[PDB]
Write a protein that binds this ligand. Structure first.
Ligand SMILES: CCCCCCCCCCCCCCCCCC(=O)OC[C@H](COP(=O)([O-])OCC(O)COP(=O)([O-])OC[C@@H](COC(=O)CCCCCCCCCCCCCCCCC)OC(=O)CCCCCCCCCCCCCCCCC)OC(=O)CCCCCCCCCCCCCCCCC
Ligand SMILES: CCCCCCCCCCCCCCCCCC(=O)OC[C@H](COP(=O)([O-])OCC(O)COP(=O)([O-])OC[C@@H](COC(=O)CCCCCCCCCCCCCCCCC)OC(=O)CCCCCCCCCCCCCCCCC)OC(=O)CCCCCCCCCCCCCCCCC
Ligand SMILES: CCCCCCCCCCCCCCCCCC(=O)OC[C@H](COP(=O)([O-])OCC(O)COP(=O)([O-])OC[C@@H](COC(=O)CCCCCCCCCCCCCCCCC)OC(=O)CCCCCCCCCCCCCCCCC)OC(=O)CCCCCCCCCCCCCCCCC
Ligand SMILES: CCCCCCCCCCCCCCCCC[C@@H](O)O[C@H](CO[C@H](O)CCCCCCCCCCCCCCC)COP(=O)(O)OCC[N+](C)(C)C
Ligand SMILES: CCCCCCCCCCCCCCCCC[C@@H](O)O[C@H](CO[C@H](O)CCCCCCCCCCCCCCC)COP(=O)(O)OCC[N+](C)(C)C
Ligand SMILES: CCCCCCCCCCCCCCCCC[C@@H](O)O[C@H](CO[C@H](O)CCCCCCCCCCCCCCC)COP(=O)(O)OCC[N+](C)(C)C
Ligand SMILES: CCCCCCCCCCCCCCCCC[C@@H](O)O[C@H](CO[C@H](O)CCCCCCCCCCCCCCC)COP(=O)(O)OCC[N+](C)(C)C
Ligand SMILES: CCCCCCCC/C=C\CCCCCCCC(=O)OC[C@H](COP(=O)(O)OCCN)OC(=O)CCCCCCC/C=C\CCCCCCCC
Ligand SMILES: CCCCCCCC/C=C\CCCCCCCC(=O)O[C@H](COC(=O)CCCCCCC/C=C/CCCCCCCC)COP(=O)(O)OCCN
Lengths: 56, 53, 70, 121, 459, 347, 54, 107, 140
């Protein structure tokens, strides 16, 4: 029965929500270090016609 | 530590009594007024280390 | 399929490592420079740091003192 | 470092005027979030000591705890950032004004550096 | 790396807001899910590392340790479910909180990219373990045990901190990447000798090195079952990981500073093994066997060769799994008999046959039967030691024989012979215990199929 | 005493401390110390009994001798230079006298003997005040004249204080004497870093004051002054014992608690001045403080001691007066390590 | 097992540390509480600091 | 000696409880049969079915980021080229001496 | 003061055994006198005569320890022809510990004293060689 089993099983969303938030947090960190994106001597490449960044 | 309340407010709670050459009553000079005045004017605004050297 | 839906390419990690290494090397150089600057300032006293107070010269009274020789 | 005697310093100013040229910390700063977490923990401990239902005893009291911690943490973060900015400013100015104490090292290449080799045997 | 850290943190509110009768179920399910998530760290490169951010990075040395750490938590929960039945809800939640905090501290410690950060978490792992030992331990010796486990550790690690800050005032950085790329030789000097000792002794005392190992039997025999599991499986490997990381700045001093420890290990592994031949306590025997295996790991790290490092990594993983399984078997006997003496409960193969099969497999794995990864690590270490000096084989060979002896000794005393007549309370094995043993033993035999996963960064 | 008189005396104590902290004239600093000592005596003797009177006279004699030598140092400094400003000391003999006087005011070894007896004689509130507030003025004066201290004497007294506190705490079953010896050791840690960085001294003082306030308030809440009396608290309020155990772990310098922040920082600072042996010995000796903290934790919350029947009545009653800022003190004394870089605020 | 592990390794590191720290604790804390001896010691340390550190 | 020879008022040591007595098919997880059955089910499903099988399959099919087959192909091409042109396979010098400036001893 | 330290240090390590022994004896006597003064202050045993006996015993013990250490270390450095080597100091230190153990008439203290003293003397020699500071000056 909805609105009754929720009061007992709302706990089961905490860990998956933590997982999604952790993935989102990881993505944010990546943006900060883009100082050498497409600038390394090994992977220096010319952009595609509809490409803005080589990686995200 | 030292909280310079006097300098913040411009109060002069105890600075009047710190040196010989600071506004004595009836303009009575200290025995070593000139030497103290010269030393203070030499050391002013320079810092303790440079003043000592 | 696993590589496509779970991972990125080598260049991402490569260039992130380059950026991280640059940041850390700059920080190490700055730490060494700060230690040397602190040593010089404390030894000489000619910098903004380690300034120890001297008597304010605005406290001196410049008036005739009932005696000609001060 | 001892910047207590730094020239042009107001005796009892928490944040000088020149501190306003620096970017303020964001409201989603991780340190601000940690300060709010500290306030929440203080509220929970206050509930536990007074023998009240820990999670849901006083919502107004817990909210005040978190808000006070966040407020003080924001101002503390501003002052800390300003102090580190002053440190770096003085360091760079001193290095600029004393070029003979910080010479440019003649760059050398590993192909012309003789480093001793120690075999692992 | 936060995709693993954040759910582990979310375990705490999930535990505390759970129903009184649903703490174990929720904790076990979500710990298993976190282990499944952490399985993705195994995809490593032959290049530098998985440098996620400025704070955390992963390697093929760190990834298997992280996977083992995340996998051990559900097993510890299952093992603790039994003896904590008559405990209040709040104290059970506190126990689970201690386990979660230990897992969080370990996770961060393995992936930390800074030596100081590593030191802080490496010490933070002490508080939950000390609380677990001295609060939920059974006998009165636990207090003394806790004291030992603390002070030994601290006596080693306070100098390290000093050395660490000293290093950061000289090189300018404690980041491991910069430290590796900017390494410089250590000249033979008294100051350098004492810096070497400060950097080494903290990790030596936690392996533990022979002669500094007195805390381990006390702590392991006095701890509850989950504490014994985490102490034998993960906390011992912290010293090995630390020595593997820190030896990059200690060369070429290690060429001659390693002699006192190598001897202390090569002879020590004999002594402890022989100690296992005359032991009246199961947990004490298992702890001393752990000491012998870790002495072999110490030799591997001090030799400082690629085969040595591969063998040390493989042996660390294998010993973690095997010792955890052996402690669980001993505890499953203890909860029936309440004695912890080997010769009291006898002839148990007749009364519990499947548990006897579990005992046999665990003894075979501890005996390093090929092609187990225990033998893979042992053989790689032995080959590297033989290259170091051909005489070492003698000691190594002796250890092998002795090990088999005591392993089979433990199997024969408890499982074979005639049952004890007056012991009439030996109930059939529960599904929980059988599942615990199966979840210990299946990963080992699975890992023997892909050994490259546990061979470290020098593979 | 009358609450109005008590409030006036407390305000006079704080005003003497603030007069020491804000003045630039040596005579005014001496006057602030005199005012603080004058107002401090009734606070110690608030609950009249022979023990409190004895503690008050011991404290008076010690502080009066220290103030007399402070005046002597001021006069010698004035003799060799017509200066009244608190700055460089201008004379080695005067500076040695000033250092010794301030050391006896603080209770550093070898002038540590009065601290355990005074703390044992007085109540817990007076002990809280004596061990927290009565350290601000001498430490501020020491910070102002740090550039003139002879480092040998300061470091000798600091190391002696750490050793004496560690050794004397091992033998104690009275909680107030345990606090006194802990205070002596923490004072040694604070003064071992004055020659190199006064910011580290202030940070250590703040952390120590927070931890001491938390522990004293926890001891007042569970009105216990002995180990065995504290061993009964779990049967009435186990939450208090658990909080006290975590606070004791923090006071032992164990990471990742707050009490690790000072030693760490101090060690780092000392290493920056090519000082290696002394921080090593200091950490080795702090291990003793940690040991007797752990013994208290064993007797208090990690095990359950026997109780008494009359405890059942106590189950039916609640504390009438609740101390504010206790939860904040506990949190600040346990969980502020991640905020360590805030020390640049020159706290 | 007995001679080395249970006796001499125990004798060397932990037991010696415990014995020395306990003896030092008894030495330091065993004071009668008489201000006589305390202030005599204060006089001695004052003289030592006057005639040793300068 | 009228002492009771009792040191204090203490509960007797309770006897251990058999889970099979009140509930055959006990599974050893909990004294509540329903909670016990569901604990068994969740442990078995999330340990054997999910982690042990799917995780093992995931690890088995991990893509070659260690670049073993890439190294094999590169070595094959190098060996082909060097055998074709008579070059002596691997060279003793890792870096060509043209770019190393040794120090003159002049001893 | 540091006068006694200067008198001991100004002598070269491998020469003037008598002078080194005399300087070490003086340093030991001063340390014993200081310890005697502290012990008399904190613990007045029974009377003036017992106090002077205790003072004499402590001073003689400390002076003998110092003398034995100095003589043994200087002789070892001279006959081994390897000055600036911490083993000579270690040997001297062990001898001092043994001298103390014999004075107290117990093997455990002598054995314990010899090992610890030998270590301390070797450490002091290493610190002299490498320039370790116990009381560091405020450099930064
Ligand atoms: C890197 C670290 C990361 C994690 C950080 C860890 C710290 C964080 C929290 C810090 C403290 C704050 C909270 C604690 C307050 C204490 C209250 C308490 O006792 O608990 C009772 C209470 C339940 O009991 P109750 O029915 O309400 O009333 C019972 C009475 O309170 C009293 O019950 P009782 O009297 O019947 O029971 C007595 C019991 C009660 O004794 C206690 O429980 C006292 C608690 C310990 C002292 C706290 C120390 C202060 C902080 C220091 C932390 C140290 C961390 C450093 C690492 C070292 C690890 C030790 O005492 C004993 O049994 C004696 C035996 C002692 C056993 C060994 C002692 C070990 C203590 C160490 C604990 C450290 C971790 C604690 C974690 C949280 C514990 C609640 O607990 C809770 O439910 C509250 C916990 C937190 C609530 C979370 C809810 C938020 C969820 C919302 C959504 C999720 C958020 C995410 C957002 C995104 C979603 C969309
Ligand atoms: C050999 C080829 C096999 C092919 C067929 C498939 C084999 C499947 C094996 C699965 C893995 C082992 C499972 C262990 C847990 C058992 C659970 C259980 O309770 O079962 C009860 C179940 C029902 O019995 P019950 O009526 O309840 O029993 C009542 C009592 O408990 C009475 O119980 P019990 O007396 O029947 O006790 C069970 C029995 C058997 O139980 C065990 O001993 C299991 C553990 C044996 C190995 C111990 C570790 C040694 C290191 C292994 C590392 C390699 C792992 C390979 C990958 C494994 C992946 C999981 O005890 C023994 O017979 C002693 C085994 C000594 C084996 C010595 C030789 C080992 C190395 C052989 C060479 C392997 C590589 C060759 C490479 C060169 C050629 C390609 O009976 C069985 O299932 C027994 C299975 C037969 C034994 C299989 C042994 C060969 C397989 C070894 C591992 C897989 C090799 C794959 C490649 C083969 C080529
Ligand atoms: C880390 C990996 C594993 C490591 C394993 C652990 C190994 C390390 C621990 C080894 C410990 C062995 C030695 C401990 C110290 C012995 C003294 C003692 O315990 O005091 C208690 C005890 C003092 O008690 P007491 O009240 O004076 O008399 C009790 C006896 O009944 C009365 O006896 P007595 O009066 O008949 O004695 C006369 C005579 C003993 O007569 C003899 O026949 C023995 C002479 C040979 O003594 C002598 O003349 C001295 C020679 O001392 C003894 O009784 C025995 C002392 C003679 C033993 C010689 C020591 C053996 C070799 C030591 C050198 C090895 C290296 C040392 C390193 C030094 C630089 C770092
Ligand atoms: C024929 C098939 C054979 C192979 C079978 C494979 C089995 C796969 C299961 C193993 C999963 C490995 C763990 C992966 C978790 C970490 C990886 C993570 O990074 O991926 C995230 C995705 O997360 C996944 O969804 C996690 C899946 C975990 C769930 C497992 C499924 C079964 C679990 C059972 C749940 C309960 C069942 C109900 C019971 C009542 C997205 O992160 P992101 O930073 O963007 O990646 C950047 C790269 N991009 C650009 C390609 C996106
Ligand atoms: C207790 C359970 C085990 C715990 C762990 C034990 C492991 C720690 C062992 C320490 C390793 C050795 C330390 C120093 C090794 C350096 C080599 C040196 O000692 O040998 C000779 C040194 O000669 C003598 O050893 C001089 C020192 C003698 C005094 C030291 C004490 C000797 C025994 C003490 C053992 C006590 C250990 C326990 C302490 C509590 C070499 O002669 P020399 O060429 O000139 O010196 C070379 C070094 N240089 C280049 C810096 C100059
Ligand atoms: C446990 C951590 C310590 C807690 C401390 C108590 C917290 C509550 C106090 C509330 C804030 C008090 C600040 C007062 C408001 C204005 C202050 C201003 O007027 O004064 C300035 C001074 O501001 C204060 O110094 C800053 C106080 C901030 C303390 C935070 C640092 C804590 C260390 C890091 C631990 C993280 C704690 C975060 C959680 C609270 C100017 O100082 P100045 O007169 O020119 O120089 C004298 C001081 N000298 C000599 C050292 C140079
Ligand atoms: C009981 C009675 C018998 C019934 C059963 C009869 C059938 C017998 C079969 C059982 C074993 C026989 C051996 C047959 C081996 C075939 C499978 C093998 O080839 O796959 C291996 C693969 O095995 C896996 O790689 C290893 C398993 C992963 C182990 C991870 C553990 C799971 C997580 C648990 C927690 C972790 C705890 C420990 C932390 C370290 C190696 O494959 P590989 O040639 O290479 O490449 C795969 C294909 N490629 C080329 C496309 C990539
Ligand atoms: C210079 C100073 C160096 C300081 C070294 C600090 C060592 C840290 C431990 C200090 C503990 C000393 C106190 C002590 O143990 O007392 C003896 C005590 C008496 O029992 P109590 O509980 O006090 O009373 C019960 C009856 N009512 O005996 C014990 O319990 C011993 C158990 C604790 C010892 C555990 C192991 C400690 C030693 C391990 C080795 C590490 C030594 C560290 C320094 C070595 C040098 C690097
Ligand atoms: C399980 C118990 C183990 C206890 C720990 C054992 C390890 C002890 C290691 C030595 C302790 C101090 C380490 C020093 C920290 C490193 C910093 C460093 O190396 O700097 C050195 C300083 O080195 C020292 O000063 C060390 C001196 C030793 C003092 C402390 C003695 C501690 C005990 C020593 C003997 C025991 C060591 C081995 C014990 C084995 C295990 C029992 C250079 O100093 P500078 O003057 O700046 O440079 C010289 C050029 N001007």
């Amino acid at each position: 029965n909805v609105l009754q089993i929720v009061r007992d099983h709302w706990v089961h969303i905490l860990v998956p929500v933590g997982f999604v938030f952790g993935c989102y947090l990881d993505r944010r960190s990546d943006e900060k270090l883009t100082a050498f994106r497409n600038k390394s001597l090994l992977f220096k490449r010319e952009l595609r016609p509809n490409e803005e960044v080589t990686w995200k | 530590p030292f909280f310079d309340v006097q300098k913040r407010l411009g109060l002069d709670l105890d600075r009047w009594m710190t040196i010989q050459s600071a506004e004595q009553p009836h303009k009575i000079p200290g025995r070593c007024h000139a030497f103290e005045k010269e030393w203070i004017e030499c050391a002013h605004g320079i810092g303790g280390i440079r003043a000592e050297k | 399929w696993i590589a496509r839906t779970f991972y990125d390419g080598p260049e991402k990690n490569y260039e992130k490592t380059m950026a991280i290494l640059q940041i850390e090397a700059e920080k190490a150089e700055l730490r060494l420079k700060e230690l040397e600057v602190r040593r010089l300032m404390r030894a000489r006293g000619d910098g903004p740091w380690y300034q120890y107070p001297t008597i304010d010269k605005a406290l001196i009274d410049h008036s005739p003192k009932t005696t000609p020789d001060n | 470092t001892m910047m207590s005697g730094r020239p042009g310093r107001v005796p009892l100013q928490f944040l000088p005027n020149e501190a306003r040229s620096l970017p303020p910390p964001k409201l989603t700063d991780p340190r601000l979030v940690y300060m709010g977490f500290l306030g929440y923990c203080s509220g929970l401990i206050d509930n536990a000591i007074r023998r009240r239902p820990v999670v849901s005893a006083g919502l107004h009291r817990q909210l005040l705890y978190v808000t006070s911690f966040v407020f003080f943490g924001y101002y503390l973060l501003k002052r800390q950032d300003y102090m580190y900015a002053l440190r770096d400013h003085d360091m760079f100015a001193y290095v600029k004004s004393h070029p003979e104490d910080f010479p440019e090292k003649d760059k050398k290449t590993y192909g012309e550096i003789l480093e001793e080799f120690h075999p692992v045997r | 790396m936060l995709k693993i850290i954040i759910p582990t943190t979310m375990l705490l509110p999930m535990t505390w807001m759970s129903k009184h009768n649903m703490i174990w179920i929720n904790a076990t399910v979500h710990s298993l899910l976190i282990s499944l998530i952490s399985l993705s760290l195994l995809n490593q490169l032959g290049e530098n590392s998985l440098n996620f951010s400025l704070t955390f990075f992963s390697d093929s040395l760190s990834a298997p340790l992280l996977v083992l750490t995340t996998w051990l938590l559900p097993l510890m929960l299952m093992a603790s479910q039994s003896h904590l039945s008559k405990e209040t809800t709040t104290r059970k939640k506190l126990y689970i909180t201690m386990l979660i905090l230990l897992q969080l501290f370990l996770i961060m410690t393995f992936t930390a990219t800074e030596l100081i950060l590593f030191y802080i978490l490496f010490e933070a792992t002490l508080v939950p373990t000390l609380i677990i030992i001295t609060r939920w331990g059974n006998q009165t010796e636990r207090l003394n045990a806790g004291l030992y486990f603390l002070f030994y550790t601290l006596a080693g690690s306070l100098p390290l901190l000093v050395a660490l800050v000293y290093i950061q005032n000289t090189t300018g950085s404690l980041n491991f990447l910069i430290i590796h790329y900017w390494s410089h030789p250590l000249s033979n000097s008294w100051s350098n000798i004492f810096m070497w000792l400060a950097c080494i002794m903290a990790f030596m005392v936690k392996m533990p090195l022979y002669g500094l190992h007195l805390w381990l039997p006390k702590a392991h025999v006095e701890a509850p079952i989950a504490g014994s599991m985490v102490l034998a499986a993960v906390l011992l490997k912290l010293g090995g990981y630390g020595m593997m990381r820190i030896t990059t700045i200690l060369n070429p001093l290690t060429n001659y500073m390693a002699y006192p420890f190598l001897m202390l290990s090569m002879w020590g592994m004999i002594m402890t093994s022989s100690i296992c031949l005359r032991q009246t306590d199961l947990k004490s025997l298992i702890a001393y066997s752990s000491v012998s295996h870790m002495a072999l790991v110490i030799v591997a790290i001090m030799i400082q060769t690629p085969w040595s490092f591969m063998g040390a990594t493989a042996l660390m993983i294998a010993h973690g799994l095997t010792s955890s399984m052996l402690f669980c078997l001993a505890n499953t006997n203890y909860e029936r008999v309440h004695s912890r003496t080997m010769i009291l409960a006898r002839g148990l193969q007749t009364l519990l046959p499947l548990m006897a099969t579990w005992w046999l497999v665990a003894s075979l794995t501890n005996l390093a039967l090929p092609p187990s990864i225990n033998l893979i690590g042992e053989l790689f270490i032995i080959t590297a030691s033989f290259s170091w000096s051909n005489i070492t084989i003698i000691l190594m060979g002796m250890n092998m024989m002795i090990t088999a002896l005591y392993s089979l000794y433990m199997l024969i005393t408890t499982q074979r012979g005639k049952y004890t007549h007056h012991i009439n309370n030996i109930k059939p094995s529960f599904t929980r215990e059988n599942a615990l043993m199966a979840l210990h033993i299946l990963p080992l035999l699975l890992l023997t199929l892909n050994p490259k996963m546990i061979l470290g960064p020098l593979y | 005493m009358n609450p109005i008189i008590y409030t006036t005396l407390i305000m006079t104590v704080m005003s003497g401390t603030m007069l020491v902290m804000i003045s630039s004239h040596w005579l005014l600093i001496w006057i602030g110390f005199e005012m603080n000592l004058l107002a401090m005596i009734p606070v110690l003797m608030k609950n009249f009994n022979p023990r409190a009177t004895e503690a008050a006279t011991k404290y008076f004699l010690t502080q009066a001798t220290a103030s007399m030598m402070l005046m002597m140092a001021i006069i010698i400094n004035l003799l060799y230079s017509g200066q009244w400003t608190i700055t460089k000391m201008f004379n080695p003999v005067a500076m040695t006298m000033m250092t010794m006087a301030l050391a006896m005011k603080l209770g550093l070894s070898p002038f540590h003997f009065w601290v355990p007896e005074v703390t044992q004689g007085i109540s817990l509130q007076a002990g809280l005040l004596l061990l927290t507030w009565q350290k601000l003025a001498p430490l501020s004066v020491l910070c102002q004249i740090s550039q003139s201290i002879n480092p040998n004497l300061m470091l000798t007294m600091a190391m002696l204080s750490i050793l004496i506190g560690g050794w004397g705490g091992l033998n104690q079953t009275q909680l107030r004497k345990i606090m006194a010896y802990s205070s002596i050791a923490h004072m040694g840690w604070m003064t071992a870093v004055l020659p190199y960085n006064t910011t580290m001294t202030i940070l250590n003082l703040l952390i120590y004051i927070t931890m001491t306030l938390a522990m004293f308030m926890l001891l007042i809440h569970s009105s216990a002054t002995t180990t065995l009396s504290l061993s009964h608290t779990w049967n009435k309020m186990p939450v208090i014992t658990s909080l006290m155990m975590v606070t004791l772990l923090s006071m032992g310098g164990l990471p990742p608690l707050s009490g690790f922040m000072p030693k760490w920082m101090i060690i780092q600072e000392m290493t920056k001045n090519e000082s290696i042996i002394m921080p090593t010995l200091m950490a080795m000796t702090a291990l003793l403080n940690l040991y007797f903290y752990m013994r208290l934790a064993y007797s208090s919350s990690l095990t359950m001691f026997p109780s008494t029947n009359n405890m059942k009545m106590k189950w039916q009653f609640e504390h009438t007066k609740q101390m504010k800022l206790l939860p904040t003190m506990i949190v600040l004394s346990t969980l502020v390590l991640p905020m360590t870089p805030a020390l640049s605020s020159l706290n | 097992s007995s001679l080395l592990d249970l006796i001499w390794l125990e004798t060397i590191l932990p037991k010696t540390t415990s014995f020395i720290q306990m003896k030092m604790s008894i030495m330091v804390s065993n004071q009668k509480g008489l201000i006589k001896l305390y202030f005599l010691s204060f006089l001695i340390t004052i003289m030592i600091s006057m005639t040793l550190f300068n | 000696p009228p002492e009771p020879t009792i040191r204090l008022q203490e509960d007797p040591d309770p006897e251990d409880e058999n889970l099979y007595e009140k509930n055959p098919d006990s599974h050893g997880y909990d004294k509540d049969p329903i909670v016990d059955l569901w604990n068994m089910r969740v442990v078995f499903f999330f340990g054997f079915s999910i982690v042990l099988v799917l995780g093992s399959t995931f690890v088995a099919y991990l893509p070659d980021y260690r670049m073993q087959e890439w190294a094999r192909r590169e070595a094959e091409r190098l060996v082909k080229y060097r055998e074709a042109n008579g070059l002596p396979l691997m060279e003793s010098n890792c870096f060509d001496p043209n770019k190393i400036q040794l120090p003159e001893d002049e001893d | 003061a540091k006068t006694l330290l200067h008198k001991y240090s100004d002598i070269p390590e491998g020469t003037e055994c008598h002078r080194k022994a005399y300087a070490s004896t003086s340093i030991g006597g001063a340390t014993g006198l200081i310890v005697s003064a502290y012990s008399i202050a904190l613990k007045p045993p029974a009377s003036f005569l017992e106090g002077v006996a205790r003072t004499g015993r402590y001073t003689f013990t400390s002076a003998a320890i110092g003398a034995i250490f100095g003589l043994t270390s200087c002789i070892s450095a001279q006959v081994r022809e390897k000055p600036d080597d911490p083993l000579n100091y270690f040997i001297g230190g062990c001898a001092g510990g043994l001298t103390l153990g014999a004075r107290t008439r117990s093997y455990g203290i002598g054995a314990a004293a010899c090992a610890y003293m030998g270590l301390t003397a070797a450490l002091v020699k290493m610190g002299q060689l490498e320039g370790w500071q116990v009381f560091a000056e405020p450099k930064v």
